[PDB]
Amino acid sequence: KSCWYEEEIEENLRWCFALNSILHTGASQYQDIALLDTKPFGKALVLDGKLQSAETDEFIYHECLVHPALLHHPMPKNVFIMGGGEGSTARELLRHKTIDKVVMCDIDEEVVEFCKSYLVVNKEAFHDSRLEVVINDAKAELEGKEEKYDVIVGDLADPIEGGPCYKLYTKDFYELTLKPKLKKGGIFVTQAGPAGIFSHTEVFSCIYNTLRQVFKYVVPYSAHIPSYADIWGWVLASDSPLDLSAEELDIRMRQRIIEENRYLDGKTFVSSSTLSKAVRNSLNNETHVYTE
Amino acid sequence: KSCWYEEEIEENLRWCFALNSILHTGASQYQDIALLDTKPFGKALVLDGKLQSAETDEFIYHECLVHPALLHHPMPKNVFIMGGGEGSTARELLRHKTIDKVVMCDIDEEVVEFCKSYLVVNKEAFHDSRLEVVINDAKAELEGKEEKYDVIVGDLADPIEGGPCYKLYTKDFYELTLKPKLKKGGIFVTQAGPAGIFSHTEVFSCIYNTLRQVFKYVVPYSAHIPSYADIWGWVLASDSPLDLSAEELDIRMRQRIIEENRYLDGKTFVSSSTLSKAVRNSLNNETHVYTE
Amino acid sequence: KSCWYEEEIEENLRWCFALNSILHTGASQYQDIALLDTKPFGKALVLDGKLQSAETDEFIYHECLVHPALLHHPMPKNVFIMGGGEGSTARELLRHKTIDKVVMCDIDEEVVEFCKSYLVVNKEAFHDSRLEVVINDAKAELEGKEEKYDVIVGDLADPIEGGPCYKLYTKDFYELTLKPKLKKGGIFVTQAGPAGIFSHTEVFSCIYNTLRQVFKYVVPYSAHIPSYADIWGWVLASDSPLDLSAEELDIRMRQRIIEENRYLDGKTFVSSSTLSKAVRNSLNNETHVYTE
Amino acid sequence: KSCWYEEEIEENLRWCFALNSILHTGASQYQDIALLDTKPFGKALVLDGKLQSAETDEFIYHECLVHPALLHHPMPKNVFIMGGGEGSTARELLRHKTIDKVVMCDIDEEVVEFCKSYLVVNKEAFHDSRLEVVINDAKAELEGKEEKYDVIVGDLADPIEGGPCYKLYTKDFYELTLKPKLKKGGIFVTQAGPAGIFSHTEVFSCIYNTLRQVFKYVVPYSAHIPSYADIWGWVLASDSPLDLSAEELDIRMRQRIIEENRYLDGKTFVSSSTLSKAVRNSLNNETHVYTE
C-alpha cells in the first residue's frame, strides 16, 4: 500500500492508483513518456504526467474512437490517423477486413518507438504490412500530400488555446485542410475530450459545434472510461448521412471486423449517441467555434 | 490545496476531494455520520467513511431512482421508501402532483435528524405534510402493516453477505414481503449498486436476476455519477409492463412533475436503459439469485 | 483516517497530518488564515497554507526565539517584536519579571484579532497590561518612533527576494534602522529559517552572514521542531558580548522567568549553539549579504 | 509530481517522498525488501515498508553510530556488528586504519545479498578483506563463539515487545552474553531509537537506563536525520570512561580515519551528547529496565 501514482483530474480532485512499478521511460522534446505498472488498471501509458491508456480499459476508448466511423462507411479502404503513436487506434482499424492501408501520422517518434516496444498489445498491429508510420505534424502531412482517405481519425490531445494540437480542431483546418482529403462518402471522427455532466462544456461542445460549421452531418457520442474517472467523447462528421440502426451496425461488425468487440455493439452505439438532457442542451446552444 | 478527504473507493484506488471544512458529525448504533464541505462537489454526506450524497450531483442519483418508476405508473399516489433518511428521495417524490402520501422508513433516526437539521436542500421536503417519517427496519415495518403502495422505493446500501441490508434484496423478501404490499399495477424500484463496465458484476447483475425470478417485467438502467467515479444502477420491477416512449415520458413529466428535471428527460431514460454490450450479456446470462 | 492536511515542505516531500476539523478561518489582503484541529500536533495555525504554530510543540520555537536573548541581557526592560501577531512570542517575553513593556508590531490586524480570540494559550498574554499592540509594518514603525529598546525580536517570515519581509533582513535595515533603536547593551534576535543539514543554506547562513556585517557579536543556534519536519534556526546579535555558561543561564532563568521552561535550560542552549561540522562550515564561508 | 512513496511514520502522520522509480525488490522469512529511487533522498532501502537508509543522509546515522565508539577506544582492532546487512556500518568501520577485522552478523542473508548487489556506495566495503559476513542471530552467534571484541555495534531494529530484536536489548543479554565478549577496555554502542522531544520516551530512555544497570560509563547522544523526520539516538557503554575533548576527537580522526567525515567533527559529538532539558530529565529519571 506504499507507492501511488496520483493525478489531479480536475483541480481539487485527485485520482490515485497503487503502483507495482515504474516499468520504462523515455522523454522527447514533445513530452515526458512513462509506462507504469498499476494495480487497479494494469500497465498505464502516461504522457506529461497524464494517463493516456490503461491496460484494463483502453479497449473502450479505442473501440469507441474507431468502429463507429468505419462501420457507417460502405467500404472503408484507406485511413489516416492524426496522432496514434500509442498504436491501439491502428490495432483497432486493422481488425477491419475492408482496410488496405492505415497511415499513422504521429509528431513524436519517441512515442512510436516506445509503444512499439513496450505496449505489446499492439505488437501485431505495428508489424501489419498495411500500416505505414509517418513521423510528422499531421496538419503538415495532410496539407503536403494529395492522397484522399475514406476515414480520417483524430487521436490527438484536447484543443487548448496556445497549445500544440489546437490548430487541428479549427474551422479552417476542417474546411480547408481536412475535407479536401476525404473521398466522397468520407467520414471524419475525432476524440473530443471529457463528456461528463459538468465536464462536457470544456471542449466537447465546442468541437461538436465547430464540426457543425463545416460538415453536413455531425454525430456526438460518449462512453465511460473507468481509468479516466469520467465520461469521454468522440464526434463523427461527414457530408453523407450517419444513420444506421443497432442491428445494421451489428451485421456490419460480424461481416467486417475480425474477432468480437468487447465494448461496442450496435445498441451500445445507439445509447452512446443518445446524450443526456443537459449535455444535448449545451451542444445545441453552443456558439463557440474554434478558429485561427 | 491543503485539506483533503480521501476515500479508497476500490482496492488500490483512492479518490480525493479538497475540503473547505468539516461541517458536522454524528453517530448511532448503525453508523458514523459526517457532513463535509468539499470543493469539487459541495456538501457531502458521509456514512461510515463512505460517500453517500454530494450537493453538486446527487440530483442525478435521486432523479434516476424516483422519476422512471412514477412516470410509468398511470396514477401513483402512495409510496414507501426503504431507507431515504438523507431526504433527497423524498424531495424528488414530492415533486409529483399525483402523490398524496410518502412514507420514509429509515432504521437510523440519527441519520434522519442529522439530514433534517443540516441538508438545506431537503428542508422543505422534510416539512411537507404528505411526508411521514417512520424509524424502523423497512422489512419489519412492511410485514407489520397491511397497507399497500403504488410504488415502493429501495434506497438502501448494497446487499453485502452478512450485512444489515442483504435481507432486503432476497427472492423471499421480494416474493413474500414486498410483492404483497404493492397495489395492483404496483411498481418497485431499487438502487442496484455499481454498473460500470467491470463493477456491474458485484451486485447489479444479481439484483436484476433476483427481481426476474419474482416480477414479470424488469427493466435495469444506469447513469454516471461524477462524485462516485462510476456508473450507478437501478432496477424497475412490476407485474405490468414498463414501456413508454421518450415522447410519452416527456409529456408525463410536463403533466405531473413540478418544475424541470435537471438530469432526466425521456431520451435520457431510453439511453439509460440501453446497457452496453458486456453489461447486457452479464445481466442476461446471470444465474445467482439472492436467498437467505 | 479520511481527512488530512498536507503540506509540501520541500518540493517532492509531503508532510501530512490527520485532521479532526477545520476550526476557524479568516483571510486578509496579507494572507489566508486558518486554525486546524490536527491529530498528531493539536491545534495548528496555518498562514497562506503554511503551518506556523502547532499546539504540541510551538513552545520549542517560542522559548528558543525569546529566552536566550533576554537572558544574555543584564536587565531587559523594554522589547519590540517585529511580527508576533500569533501572540506566543509575547507570552514568552511576558514571563520575564524584568519586563515592563512589550510592543507587538504586526502588519496584519486580522492575524492579531484571530489569535487573540482563538489561540487561547495566549489569552493572558494578550490581556497583560504590559503589552502594547501596534498594527503596522515593523520597518515603518521603527523608523517613525524614537524609542529605543533593550531587545528587538524578529518573528517574521523568511526573506524571499521580491517578498513582503525581505527588507527587514537587509544589511541597511540592521545598520540604519535597527541598531539605532537598540540601547547600549541591546540584543537583537531573529528567527532565521530552516537549519537542517541541507536546508541551512537557504536563508540561515545568509542571515547569520548579514548580521555579521553589522553587529560585533553574532551567535547562531538551532533546534528541532517536530511539526516543522526540520531543524529551525535563530540568530542573536549584539555589540556587547554574548557568552554565558549553561549554569549562568540556568541561574538567570530561575531568578527572572516565571514558571519552568519546558524546552530550554542552559545546557540546551549551549548544545543549540554548537552547530554541526557542515553547518558551521557553511556559516563560516558564507559570502552572501542581503541588500536593498 | 505524479509518483509517491508514502509511509505512516507515526499514527496520523504521513511522510511522502516523490519517486523516480522502484529499482529492485526481494523477500525472506524475516522481511520484505525494496529499493526505491526517490527525489528528495536518492536511493532508499525499505524493509517491511519502513524506511531504513536513504542515500542523501545515511552518512549521518552511520558516522554517528560508528565513529564515537572507535575514537574513544585507545586502539580498536576487532569489531562485531549485530545486524548491519545494509553495509554502511561496515563501510564506516573500515574507514579506520586501526581496524583489522569486522564481523557483520546479520540474521537475514537476503538483506545482505540484496544490498551487496544493489547498494553501490557499499560495494567496496563488502569486498574488503577485513570484512567477514556471518549469517546468524547475533545473540546465538555471540554465545556460540568465545572470541572477544574491542567494540561491539548494535545496528538492529528497535526493541518492541514480542519482536525479533527485543532480546538483544535486555539486562540479561548485556550482562551475560555481550559483556563477556568485550575485551578489557571494550566499548559497546547501540542505535537506540527515536530521540525527539516526545519520541525519546518510546525506547531511547529505556535503552539508556538498561545499559546503566550493567556498564559503569554510559553516554547517550543524538542527531537529526532528515529522511526520518526525527532525531535519532545512540548509546555508548563501557567499563572505562568515555571522555575526550572535541580537540582530542578531531586529532584522533585525523590520525585514524581515512578521508574527512562528512557529518561528525569533535564539536558535533559534544553537541550530540548534550541532550535538551526534557530529554535529559527523562533519561535521568527513567526506571524501566528491559528484561525477558
Ligand SMILES: CSC[C@H]1O[C@@H](n2cnc3c(N)ncnc32)[C@H](O)[C@@H]1O
Ligand atoms: C497526448 S497527444 C496524443 C498523441 O498525439 C501526438 N501528437 C501531438 N500533436 C500532434 C500533431 N500535431 N500531429 C500528429 N501527432 C501529434 C502525440 O505525440 C501523442 O502521441
Ligand SMILES: CSC[C@H]1O[C@@H](n2cnc3c(N)ncnc32)[C@H](O)[C@@H]1O
Ligand atoms: C447508506 S444506507 C442508506 C440508508 O438505509 C438505512 N438503512 C439501512 N438498513 C436499513 C433497513 N433494514 N431498513 C431501513 N433503512 C435502513 C440507513 O440508515 C441509511 O440511511
Ligand SMILES: CSC[C@H]1O[C@@H](n2cnc3c(N)ncnc32)[C@H](O)[C@@H]1O
Ligand atoms: C508568516 S509571517 C509571520 C507574521 O509576521 C507578520 N508580518 C509580515 N510582514 C510584516 C511586517 N513587515 N511588519 C510586521 N509584521 C509583519 C504577519 O502578519 C504574520 O503575523
Ligand SMILES: CSC[C@H]1O[C@@H](n2cnc3c(N)ncnc32)[C@H](O)[C@@H]1O
Ligand atoms: C531493520 S533491522 C536491521 C538489521 O537487523 C537484522 N536483524 C534482525 N534481528 C537480528 C538478530 N537477532 N541478529 C542479527 N541481525 C538481526 C535484519 O536482518 C536487518 O538487516
